[PDB]
């Protein structure tokens, strides 16, 4: 069998997955790669399913790539997203802090504000913004969750526990770990800001561009820079929190079907990648944004053989994570 079982988180990803299954099925040889769809409530359930041989592949934020390499799962990174263009591909992106024009505050004046995150554990939504703001947080700083809940005056951290940390779900009651939470992910953290529930969205550089097509509406938003100034959203290259490694597909170490994962995704990149097909798209969707793969991706690059999360992610970002887990001020 040449079937990749894809893990899709909730109703909408599940739909795009069935399209993906059907179009590949229709425009593929008798012998080529098939994909099957397994619906899960969260990225955590996908990670558990892949370790337990009940699924083969899920695409995860760089932060969640790290998380998934830890025991007893030991998921290995297999295919990387790239952004920008197919000519000069990039395997990183920019963590930006998006705010509404004329809101007043800057970064060392973020205390007491409302925060929209993509989700707990994610690079630009959590790890980067919270690590930089770590010593600004009140004591005690463990647990970290409870202490960012204390810093802001209400938050939305998708995937967090709302019993243990009610405040982290104030802007999105429940802290849903899927698109079913309307304020989950990139597009969801920007909807959280736009609706006026929050003051800052910790998102990627291309987030606003994919959620607001009109430049006149776009100019009512700006970014928070590290020198405590503000700059137009277009000038993200000189006003960003950090550069983070790209979302990756992960797979099992043993019997991971990584070769096939590549074969499927690479063929799928030629048939349905950016601007390639009017029947199906891999990096946009009728059913939502950033489903299965991010909207801002332009295709895929193969991860070198048998490389682990640790190595793929790089020392600067692995180190950035570990420092967050145990620090001092
Ligand atoms: Fe991300
Ligand atoms: K508070």
| Residue whose C-alpha is closest to residue 156's, from 207, 127, 121, 197 | 197
**H-type alpha helices, 158-314:** 185-194, 215-218, 258-272, 309-313
| Nearest-ligand number for the alpha carbon of 245 | 1
Q: What distances in angstroms separate CA 215 from CA 83, 102, 191, 208, 234, one per listed residue?
A: 21, 17, 17, 10, 10
Between strands 200-204 and 34-40, the pairing is: unpaired
Using the mean position of ligand 1's atoms as its centre, give its distance from the Cα of residue 204 in Å: 7
d(CA 271, CA 290): 19
- The encoded tokens of residue 201 equal 């969205």
Our CA dihedral for 37, 41, 43, 46, rounded to 10 degrees, sits at -50
What is residue 128's three-state secondary structure?
helix
Q: Which domains does the chain have, with CATH numbers?
A: 1-82+248-329 (3.40.190.10), 83-247 (3.40.190.10)
10 Å CB burial of residue 325 (0-12, 13-18, 19+) is exposed
d(CA 212, CA 109): 27
| Nearest-ligand number for the alpha carbon of 150 | 2
Cα-flanking dihedrals φ and ψ of residue 83, to 5°? -125, 175
DSSP letter (8 states) at residue 107: G
- The encoded tokens of residue 119 equal 């989700």
Using the mean position of ligand 2's atoms as its centre, give its distance from the Cα of residue 153 in Å: 4
Using the mean position of ligand 1's atoms as its centre, give its distance from the Cα of residue 119 in Å: 9
Using the mean position of ligand 2's atoms as its centre, give its distance from the Cα of residue 298 in Å: 39
Point out the annotated binding site for hydrogencarbonate. 118, 122, 124-125
Point out the annotated binding site. 61, 93, 118, 122, 124-125, 186, 247
d(CA 9, CA 82): 21
Using the mean position of ligand 1's atoms as its centre, give its distance from the Cα of residue 201 in Å: 13
Point out the annotated binding site for Fe(3+). 61, 93, 186, 247
Task: Give exposure, 219-251, as e/b (b: 16+ Cβ within 10 Å).
Answer: eebbbbbeeeebbebeebeebbbbbbbbbbbbb
CB 218 within 8 A of CB 109: no
- The encoded tokens of residue 47 equal 């990670």
Task: Give exposure, 52-69, as e/b (b: 16+ Cβ within 10 Å).
Answer: eeebbbbbbbbbbbbbbb
- The encoded tokens of residue 261 equal 């994962």
- Whose tokens are 């097909």? That residue is 277
d(CA 112, CA 325): 23
């Amino acid at each position: 069998d040449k079937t990749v079982r894809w893990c899709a988180v909730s109703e909408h990803e599940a739909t795009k997955c069935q399209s993906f299954r059907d179009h590949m099925k229709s425009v593929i040889p008798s012998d080529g790669p098939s994909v099957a769809c397994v619906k899960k409530a969260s990225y955590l359930d996908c990670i558990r399913a892949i370790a337990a041989n009940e699924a083969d592949a899920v695409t995860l934020d760089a932060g969640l790539v790290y998380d998934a390499y830890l025991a007893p799962n030991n998921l290995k990174p297999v295919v990387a997203e790239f952004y920008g263009s197919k000519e000069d591909p990039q395997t990183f992106y920019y963590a930006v802090a998006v705010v509404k024009k004329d809101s007043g505050f800057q970064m060392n004046q973020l205390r007491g504000k409302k925060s929209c995150h993509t989700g707990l554990g994610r690079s630009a939504g959590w790890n980067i913004p919270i690590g930089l703001l770590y010593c600004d947080l009140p004591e005690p700083r463990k647990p970290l969750e409870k202490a960012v809940a204390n810093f802001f005056s209400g938050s939305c951290a998708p995937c967090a526990d709302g019993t243990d940390f009610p405040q982290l779900c104030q802007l999105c009651p429940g802290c849903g770990c899927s698109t079913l939470n309307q304020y989950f992910g990139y597009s969801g953290a920007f909807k959280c800001l736009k609706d006026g529930a929050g003051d800052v969205a910790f998102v990627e550089h291309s987030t606003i561009f994919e959620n607001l097509a009109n430049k006149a509406d776009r100019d009512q938003y700006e970014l928070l820079c590290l020198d405590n100034t503000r700059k137009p959203v277009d000038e993200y290259k000189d006003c960003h929190l950090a550069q983070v490694p790209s979302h990756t597909v992960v797979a099992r170490s043993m019997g991971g079907k990584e070769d096939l994962i590549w074969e499927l995704l690479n063929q799928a990149q030629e048939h349905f990648g950016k601007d390639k097909s009017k029947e199906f798209q891999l990096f946009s969707s009728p059913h939502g944004k950033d489903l299965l793969f991010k909207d801002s991706a332009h295709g895929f690059l193969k991860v070198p053989p048998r490389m682990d999360a640790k190595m793929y992610l790089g020392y600067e970002y692995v180190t950035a994570i570990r420092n967050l887990r145990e620090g001092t001020c």
